[PDB]
Design a protein around this nucleic acid. Sequence first.
RNA 1: UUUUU
RNA 2: UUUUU
RNA 3: UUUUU
RNA 4: UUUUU
RNA 5: UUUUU
Lengths: 11, 213, 213, 53, 53
Amino acid sequence: VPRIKAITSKM
Amino acid sequence: RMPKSKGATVLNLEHLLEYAPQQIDISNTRATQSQFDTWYEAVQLAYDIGETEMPTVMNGLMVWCIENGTSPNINGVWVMMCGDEQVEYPLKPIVENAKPTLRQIMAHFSDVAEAYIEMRNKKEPYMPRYGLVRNLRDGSLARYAFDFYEVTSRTPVRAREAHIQMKAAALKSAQSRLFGLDGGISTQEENTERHTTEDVSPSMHTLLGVKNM
Amino acid sequence: RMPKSKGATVLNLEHLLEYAPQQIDISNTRATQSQFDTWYEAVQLAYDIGETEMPTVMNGLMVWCIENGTSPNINGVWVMMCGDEQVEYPLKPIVENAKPTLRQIMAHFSDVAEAYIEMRNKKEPYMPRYGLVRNLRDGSLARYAFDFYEVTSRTPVRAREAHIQMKAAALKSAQSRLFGLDGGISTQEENTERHTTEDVSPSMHTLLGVKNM
Amino acid sequence: HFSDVAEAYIEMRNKKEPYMPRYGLVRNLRDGSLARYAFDFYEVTSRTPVRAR
Amino acid sequence: RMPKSKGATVLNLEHLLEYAPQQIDISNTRATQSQFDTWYEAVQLAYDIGETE
RNA sequence: UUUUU
RNA sequence: UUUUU
RNA sequence: UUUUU
RNA sequence: UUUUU
RNA sequence: UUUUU
């Protein structure tokens, strides 16, 4: 499963 | 006798005789379908995961919530076991988008959670950590030993008693407070008084009534 | 019934049927593998010990923690028994790098600790000092009498009861405080007023309104 | 305007080491899981947890 | 199961199986041997008494 | 851990 | 931030 | 979850 | 609203 | 209804 970035562009 | 207003029954007898909703669909202990869709969409958006890999993450989250509960105060990350590796997912999107509560959202997973616990117990001793904290001494009741389990008309009477006792033991005598500390901090009044070089002191303009002797 | 959003089940049935993680791997009462690796690397770095002699130090630390607990307030040094000699290791790297807590980090050592206690009891009476403080009167329960023991689905019911009673006795009615004394010390306002040789006193510029009679 | 990024950065730094902002050290905040809100320009929103608020 | 970091057990099984310290030697309710020696030497020095008396 | 005179 | 002798 | 020295 | 160094 | 980590 993919890993979630800490600080993404969605925020 | 039917309820009547202004000489007319206020109920539709035919529709009512044909009205057979599922009990879990009209209970207020479970989040509505609209609220569940909102939560699911918000979690998809926050995780940046496509609609095909999302159910796997949902499976992992359901198992993690079986183990560790669905309290509003849970924070940090939850974990999925990808083979022998551990993948960490932030819990903030899961909790901040669950309305009215995370327990009501996860109540939609209750039947699947019970089935999963039974399946895991078919191959090894599998009591959810919630049931270990509650000190439940019966292994055949492991399928109901999670905090988001939804009691239905098909729940066995013994299981219902065990679940209610576990809920009472877990909640204890916790009393809800409607308010925290008020965010208005300033209690004094702003000092609007001038200050000139003619003032005898920073706090007194003059000493008018003062007599030297 | 499965949880559905927008006319589509939100769970992957095949993966879920094949999803069988270990219970201790997904519990939040144990530090994650990443946190454990971070703690282990930080302790290696602080001790300046190679990767070959590090497991021996880990053995010594595990035995010491079985004896003396894993409280956040432990300080000073811990000791290893190199034959008849005593080697002292600082406890600061062990405690300051353990996240979220030292107990969660040492929970990874729980099965080995239980096995070690059983092995030591095979040759002599060996009750961990934690179980002596708790006044546990059963010697056959010595294998669970340490404060970082992790309760699992394989823990015997009697052992689970004893461990929960020991935890309740040790914690008593301790209440957590979120804050200490605030570090902002100054409460007064800075005195910005000038002071010239024309001032009648160090605190008064003049005596303007004063009348002698 | 930087509050969400600051919170995310504090969480990211805490993923690798103990990272409490000096503001939270001056305030003597004894909870490390609340480090992500322990700065003086943090903006409280409707998504802020009640305990964090 | 043993505690593992980066795909490697962090414990030495052979040494641990051979590690049998005395319980009173590793407890923190008793002063360490170094502290005891320091106290004994300080008391000898203060009392001006030989190692035989 | 300490605090047992 | 400073002010801890 | 924490708080068990 | 401000005043959180 | 909530409050079960």
